[PDB]
Amino acid sequence: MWDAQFENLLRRYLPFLSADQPLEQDINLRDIGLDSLGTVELLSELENTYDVHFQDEALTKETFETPGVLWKTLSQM
Amino acid sequence: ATAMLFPGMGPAAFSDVGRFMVTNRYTRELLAEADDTLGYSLVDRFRQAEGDYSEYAQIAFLVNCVALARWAEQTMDLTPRICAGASFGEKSVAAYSGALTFADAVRMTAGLARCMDEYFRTEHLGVVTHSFVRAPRERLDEILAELDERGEWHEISCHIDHDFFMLTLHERNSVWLEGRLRSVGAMPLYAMRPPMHAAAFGGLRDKAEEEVIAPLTFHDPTLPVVADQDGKVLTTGDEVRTMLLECFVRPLRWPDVISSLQDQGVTRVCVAGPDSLFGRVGTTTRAFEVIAATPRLALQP
Ligand SMILES: *P(=O)(O)OCC(C)(C)[C@@H](O)C(=O)NCCC(=O)NCCS[C@@H]1CC(=O)N(CCN2C(=O)CCC2=O)C1=O
């Protein structure tokens, strides 16, 4: 279970999710609008905001499949 | 000062563009000319296509891209000094710029699509083009040297930004390449088939010349066109013919196109069409104010 700092950030990259719609844990980010360059800018904002460096398995597409896997993967740093 | 930019192809479906193509009057006009030229209903064959990048999808992208440029010009009263097209977009600018009639550009696009499919049916099997980011040249060189070390063939096929490149090579090395990229913080994007932009494809270049490009009549453009191979401002039909050919065997150099544009006085850019890359990448962003002329934008009131 994540917080509002994470989610406000993440929603700036999901154009097909409306502000009045919840971010489900298992929802697929590609279908909700995240694309290649979005992912890139999203990595960027996460690495500043949280002072981490993504690497090795954290750079596979799988990391970015859902908010749930992405939050999990991020917490670990 | 403003420029007109035509983007490369990217991931999408008929659902994304279908309402636009059937509703916008620019596109309807162009679809009519395209049908009369191909001998079929483009929209109908695109509608029922079983791919991401069929022939029919490619011609539809041409049409959408050109119509959106005509659409942005009238809607937003743009008065472009100069234009440019990346990769697939070379074909878009040819038609926008006046280097070919729309009908020849449709023929062209259709011919080259068949021609790529024949060629890559048997040639350079297993070769792929990898895109990746967060990879400064320093890091990429280390990887390439490790590839040279094992005697594995490769070619840098595109320069997108300082840390954003495309590399072509046998798919046998893909998984390792991916893993090794990630080791140093680089992120794999996509692994494209067919491949594109390599000296080793001079064979494809000849076949597009003989089977498809040679019969066409090119005209000098009504505005100059910046070549995506190296930032050269072009001004004649024959220079536009050449860019379309060199494209198969010379790598795309997007920081060079941005350079010329800046050097020719350009402050602002309109990117015509659906766009996953060239209108969004930092190389374009840091230099210019961007107007994204996408089917979504053309369906607001
Ligand atoms: P993420 O998956 O959201 O984004 C990935 C990425 C940003 C790389 C996105 O832009 C992408 O997927 N690119 C699409 C690559 C792809 O799969 N293309 C398939 C082949 S199609 C297109 C058709 C075509 O002919 N070209 C160029 C060929 N060409 C020239 O460039 C000049 C002359 C010529 O024939 C295409 O790009």
B290 has which bridge partners? B269
SS3 B105: helix
* CA B10 to centroid of ligand 1, rounded, Å: 6
- What is the spatial distance between Cα B185 and Cα A56, in angstroms, rounded to a whole number? 7
Structure tokens at B237: 């039909």
Distance from CA of B32 to the nearest CA of A (A): 32
Domains annotated for chain B, with CATH where assigned, are 1-119+194-301 (3.40.366.10), 120-193 (no CATH)
Contact criterion met (CB below 8 Å) for B182 and B188? yes
Residue B196 Cα: closest atom of ligand 1: 28
Opening angle at CA A75, ends A71 and A76, nearest 5: 125
Ramachandran sector of residue B129 (left: φ over 0; alpha: ψ -120 to 50; beta: rest): beta
For residue A31, the chain B residue with the least C-alpha distance is B12
CATH of domain A1-77: 1.10.1200.10
- Ligand 1 site, residue B58, Cβ cutoff 6 A: yes
- What is the spatial distance between Cα B287 and Cα B237, in angstroms, rounded to a whole number? 28
- What is the spatial distance between Cα B272 and Cα B70, in angstroms, rounded to a whole number? 9
Resolution as reported, in Å: 2.3
Contact criterion met (CB below 8 Å) for A50 and B290? no
- What is the spatial distance between Cα A47 and Cα A41, in angstroms, rounded to a whole number? 10
Structure tokens at B114: 């068949």
- What is the spatial distance between Cα B29 and Cα B10, in angstroms, rounded to a whole number? 24
Which residue, by CA, sits nearest to atom 12 of ligand 1? B10
Structure tokens at B149: 């070390």
- What is the spatial distance between Cα B194 and Cα A68, in angstroms, rounded to a whole number? 34
How many angstroms separate the Cα of B66 from the Cα of each of A23, B91, B133, B167? 37, 10, 29, 29
Distance from CA of B180 to the nearest CA of A (A): 8
Identify which of B54, B87, B167 to mutate to test ligand 1's pocket (most ligand atoms within 8 A of the CB): B87
B272 has which bridge partners? B293
How many other C-beta atoms lie within 10 A of the C-beta of residue B95? 25
- Domains of chain A, residue spans: 1-77
Non-local CB neighbours of A2 within 8 Å, separated by 6+ positions? A67, A71
- What is the spatial distance between Cα B100 and Cα B217, in angstroms, rounded to a whole number? 7
**Residue A44 marked in a binding site:** no
